[PDB]
Amino acid sequence: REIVHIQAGQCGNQIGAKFWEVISDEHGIDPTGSYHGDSDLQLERINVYYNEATGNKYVPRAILVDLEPGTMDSVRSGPFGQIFRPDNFVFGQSGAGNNWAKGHYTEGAELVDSVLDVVRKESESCDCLQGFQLTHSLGGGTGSGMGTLLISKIREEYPDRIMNTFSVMPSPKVSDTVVEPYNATLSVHQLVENTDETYCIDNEALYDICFRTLKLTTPTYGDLNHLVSATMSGVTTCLRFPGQLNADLRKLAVNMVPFPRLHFFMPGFAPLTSRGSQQYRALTVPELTQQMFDSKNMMAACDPRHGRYLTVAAIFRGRMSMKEVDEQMLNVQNKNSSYFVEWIPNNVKTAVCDIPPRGLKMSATFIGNSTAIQELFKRISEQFTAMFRRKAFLHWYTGEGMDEMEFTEAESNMNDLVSEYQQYQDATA
Amino acid sequence: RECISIHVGQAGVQIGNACWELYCLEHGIQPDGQMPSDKTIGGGDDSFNTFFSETGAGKHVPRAVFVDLEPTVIDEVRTGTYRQLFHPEQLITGKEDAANNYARGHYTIGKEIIDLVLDRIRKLADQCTGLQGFLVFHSFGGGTGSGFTSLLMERLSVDYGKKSKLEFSIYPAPQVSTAVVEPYNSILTTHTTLEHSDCAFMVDNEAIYDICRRNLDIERPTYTNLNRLISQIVSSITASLRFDGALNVDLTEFQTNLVPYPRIHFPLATYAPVISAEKAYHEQLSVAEITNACFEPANQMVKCDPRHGKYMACCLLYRGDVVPKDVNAAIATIKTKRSIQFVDWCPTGFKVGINYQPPTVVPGGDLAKVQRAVCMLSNTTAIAEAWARLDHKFDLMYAKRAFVHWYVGEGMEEGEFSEAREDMAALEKDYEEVGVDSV
Amino acid sequence: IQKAIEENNNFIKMAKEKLAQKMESNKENREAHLAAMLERLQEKDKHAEEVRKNKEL
Ligand SMILES: */C1=C\C(=O)C/C(C)=C\C=C\C(=O)O[C@H]([C@H](O)NC(=O)/C=C\C=C\C)C/C(C)=C/[C@@H]2COC[C@H](C1)O2
Ligand SMILES: Nc1nc2c(ncn2[C@@H]2O[C@H](COP(=O)(O)OP(=O)(O)OP(=O)(O)O)[C@@H](O)[C@H]2O)c(=O)[nH]1
Ligand SMILES: Nc1nc2c(ncn2[C@@H]2O[C@H](COP(=O)(O)OP(=O)(O)OP(=O)(O)O)[C@@H](O)[C@H]2O)c(=O)[nH]1
Ligand SMILES: [Ca+2]
């Protein structure tokens, strides 16, 4: 049951490379693709993300895409850069100039066919393809515009497969590129319609965690992506290790997505405590549980206590008592009862995986489908409107052949997503 | 009088593994299928031949088919301890499961393997000289356990007519469930199979979980712990078919008493004793003790309160060192002391069977080995409480159409939901009507 | 005995038919869901043409 991974653009390639590094370490796969680990858990579902080659080598089922060569040259020289299949690198020369229209309709469209060629060569040797995961940013041009283009073309060729994204949302705390709201709004318009599940990885939240919680006074992309890759590791543990719950993309979607458009998840990670506070606060199951339901541990900048949960998946990792996990999960639900909609019974599911992330005895990862995600969409919506009402920078998009109406429609779709979250928040049994 | 077992989806398969392992130990059948005590090579008409065929090389082969829409649970049967007991062809897998979606098990994925499953069951039926019926094991909650089972039972009614079909059905609990949509799947499959099933024994995972925690002192029961207890209950029920003896009363005869109207076909099983080795030591549990325990609600396989409904039948299936005299004295004690009200249109006597073969336990298990055990099967109106709990969960979600798009996307319609739910409301009402007094 | 045969045959029949009707309705419904999806996706390829065309002017 194979997944095919695509990473597009700088952000997409940067966090995708880290994902492959982290999960390769967890599965005992070295930079040459050789297995050199201790435990049979590591190979049992290796085929989900890796093809096996001659020489007992494991090769990521991964496709690397950009409209410029730079980041992919970096990827190839990165740690684990020689593990990817050479033929799986598809790049143009142009760049997209932080312009969604260029990624989606112009330069991206010229390259998308050669990407699809490689997607199909990977898909066709799968025993039973589950679907696709895409990593990209929404705020630039290629991950945003070409990524959402790829999604729609893949969905045409594989309409009954699951489409999952890890989508990095822009924040003025990390990038000052003024057109980011335009590109994110246009991209969300696509995601709403064409993905089954999207992890909202919000740069605002990654910045706040690094700065406020971990006390990094000048967060780098490296610091942000360390959190992202930890989160990505957590939210894919159920796909990659033997287990009962959410063991495949479609089972995850059936448990997490009650209405097709409401498929935007708030991810979380515990623990997130400074080295300095660690001298005082012990790392325990109650601590993880309390932290994973706290807004400061969320990787989208939304306070769940400002909305209600439709569905939650809680994954614990490491050696710990199942009994204690069950008790804490019951306790945290009882203490937060009001924030779980009554009309979906038993809407929080819990798994435990024996293998902890590197450098921790235990962790927890949270995946919430909360109506408070509306706060991320409203933030983007307000930055979008402040520009669009003065028609700022529109010429960059209309000169690629777009008209105003496509912008009005994308805004409208996103405002309707917000309203739909509100409706389910306000609905009673 | 052969019985063919069909194990569907994860729960069905894993409970099947535990049941066949126990049956092998009860009968002296080794993991290669050899049975030295059987002196007729290549066949016979012994009581254990209801459940096992024989090859000329002396292998005793379960009359069983295991089917799952993905391979990883059945692959553990294929490579594990009892791998040689089964022909490859009795273990059948697809590649992609039903993703907790009844619609996928019944239609989208199910329809691709159904013909092959029916073809394998036919090869079993063809070796039988007097097939009596099927036993079908499955979850309510999974997409395969729910929707593939429904499909199979409809197809079996077509291919074998009115041949009896019994179910062992695993009713969901939150402590071990894996899908939010289990209530949907439960009501969809219950509605679909209701006219195709002659008798169904529901097993509430939460009652089993609680018995494991409370009586076996297991802190956090696994499926392996649940399944070992479940197999003891299943074995109690099928023992009448697999062993002989003058006081052994066949399951079909109990069923005559258990099923007053075709729809009212869900007995409540209660089993005793469930005790740990540490507690069983220096402690003999008498016939009176185990019988008393069958009227304790905490020992029931489905959480409900029989003291607040009415009985339409009570059957006691004993195993081991039990004589009628002790049974009669225990029943008489219980009649004077317990909350046992029958509907006015049914006789109030208990029906008793005794199989002398002592109960057995699997090595490395949790249950003490005991000299005598009992499974009570009662038909009480209280079992409808279990349908009421599931119906309410269905209603909360369905009023908002939560998750319904996953089913509609696989070709289902809203009408199928409301039809299923209406059938359940009618069944709840059937249970109310049979317990009202005659005018 | 003829009544018993007749009711057995009638139960088989009605079950065979209900199941063929359910399977057909299911098949058509699912195919229509797919065809609607594909048609939304083709409307997008068309709009993408119109954009690259509008650019050329
Ligand atoms: C990334 C390692 C890296 O480059 C820097 C190093 C050597 C360590 C970073 C640790 C870190 O970020 O730890 C985070 C928390 O601060 N730790 C705790 O809160 C620990 C105990 C708390 C007790 C109350 C946790 C994270 C985000 C760890 C991730 C997990 O994935 C591997 C990745 C390695 O670190
Ligand atoms: N967390 C994180 N965000 C990043 C990273 N690189 C870029 N971003 C964010 O991504 C957005 C910019 O989009 P990019 O991914 O750089 O652009 P692109 O997809 O390469 O598209 P073009 O550069 O226009 O051809 C901004 O919001 C950046 O903050 C990264 O490594 N990590
Ligand atoms: N008692 C018990 N319950 C089980 C076991 N395995 C699964 N279940 C329960 O069955 C339900 C889940 O359905 P499964 O049988 O896993 O699913 P499936 O039939 O394989 O269906 P799909 O996986 O969706 O194709 C939940 O209520 C689980 O707790 C088991 O071995 N024993
Ligand atoms: Ca013999």
Ligand SMILES: [Mg+2]
């Ligand atoms: Mg950039």
Ligand SMILES: [Mg+2]
């Ligand atoms: Mg399954």
